[PDB]
Design a binder for these strands. Structure first.
Lengths: 124, 116, 124, 116
RNA sequence: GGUCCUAGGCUACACACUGAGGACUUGUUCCUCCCCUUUCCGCCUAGGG
RNA sequence: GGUCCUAGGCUACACACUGAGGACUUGUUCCUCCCCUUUCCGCCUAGGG
């Protein structure tokens, strides 16, 4: 081989609270939307609705996070407000296998991530 | 290709330097201008803007400046933009970084990352 | 002003163990050398000599750390050995006064540092 | 100016790429070559060398390469070098970075930072 | 005055971290980017045989 | 078969982090870098009125 292949290690672990939602470029848009929607709406009697969710998107998934957050807000009759923060995320591409013995050989790069609080506001 | 819905933070920082980030814009070019501009103490604030295919780069430019300049106050605002050849809605972003404090109640506010 | 003035903030605090020696570009060479020499030699009947010291230097002080370590070993009749590690050190230049109210506005810089273990080897 | 004493890791990594760091050298030049060279999986090890006014840059190149490539094994070696141009004794070093494990007992060994 | 001991103190950076500026077959290039070498009884405080 | 409920599941990245390659008055430049749009009874699993 004149070059290493382009395998990716899983971006650490996601210390994922129940109202944390990570967005991906794999599952269908509508599903990710629908799932964020019913976390916030709860049941048909409004039971077990979240006060806020956090929508996390990395790299190319940033646009999609924004997109889901704005689509949520657009259908709330102004009951849902958004608040975006940004952050930097270290990613590790595997170059040589992690064996029993030795630390693996890895390429280090940074991606931007976005973190969108989507929260229910009510009168009074 | 033309964009459309004075500045994205006219309310918070009226005379701010506006970094209009295009897909294709070389980061190193944007960052050269941005760092020089904020090197000047009279320059109090800067804004990076982009949408669709330029969104990730918009955020990347903001994160790199925060890495060189600690203390900046940040506000991130989400908007949609319209584009024409076929007219599309694209998600987009405008990020404000301020040498001067901003009201923590501004939605999209991020306090400065301290250095321990 | 049309540009900020150079003003350096102290490189954190140095968690300084007693056998840790920081090397600087201010004090005289021979004093820094002599002081390292006495830590390792102890009194005139080898009382309270250290079995090892660590010589830390940053930026331009790297040559001077090396220099002091090689000088120490050059005059030991092979009883002093040397082991160098490197590291990256974040530096903070002040741009605008930290008040009680504000985070200061600071410029962020990296310098290489060197860490030279100088230790006494004895026949046994 | 000519250098001389008073491969630097022939014993540990006989075929290693040797980066001769000079005070003049643009870092970005050295790092381009260095990273390309270690991009090739057959390249197992690299050495950076310099003295006098090039020692800082020598260590800097080694630390930046370690930032991009996690897992490398390091050995640092201190040397004097003589320079004639009126001859001077000048401190320097040679840093070995190895995709393959080196004996931890080797003086100047630094294990790789875990990156967890 | 002499001589020994003991306890302290003796400033991590060249904005040189993908450095700066010039030159040239771009790029492991050349030039420019003040001094800091080399202790053996180091120096300075207190205190004690 | 109909209807409601409850619990759980539904993959963070374009090597796009000082990105890549072309072009040109170098540099907030231009051009190229396939799709991913937008739910409103979303889908799947188990269990209970």
């Amino acid at each position: 081989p004149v070059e290493y292949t382009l395998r990716k290690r899983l971006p650490s672990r996601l210390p994922r609270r129940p109202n944390d939602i990570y967005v991906n470029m794999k599952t269908d848009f509508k599903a990710q939307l629908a799932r964020c929607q019913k976390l916030l709406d709860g049941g048909a009697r409004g039971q077990n609705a979240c006060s806020e969710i956090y929508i996390h998107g990395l790299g190319l998934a940033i646009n999609r996070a924004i997109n889901i957050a704005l689509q949520l807000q657009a259908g709330s009759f102004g009951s849902l407000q958004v608040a975006a923060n940004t952050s930097t995320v270290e990613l590790v591409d595997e170059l040589e296998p992690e064996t029993d013995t030795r630390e693996p050989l890895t390429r280090i790069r940074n991606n931007s991530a976005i973190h969108i609080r989507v929260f229910r506001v009510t009168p009074k | 290709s033309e964009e459309a819905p004075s500045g994205p933070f006219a309310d918070l920082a009226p005379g701010a330097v506006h970094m209009r980030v295009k897909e294709g814009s070389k980061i190193r070019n944007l960052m050269a201008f941005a760092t020089a501009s904020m090197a000047q103490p009279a320059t109090r604030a800067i804004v990076f803007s982009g949408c669709g295919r330029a969104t990730t780069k918009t955020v990347t430019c903001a994160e790199i400046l925060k890495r060189r300049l600690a203390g900046l106050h940040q506000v991130t605002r989400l908007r949609y933009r319209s584009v024409r050849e076929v007219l599309k809605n694209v998600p987009g972003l405008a990020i404000l970084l301020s040498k001067d404090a901003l009201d923590p109640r501004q939605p999209g506010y991020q306090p400065p990352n301290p250095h321990p």
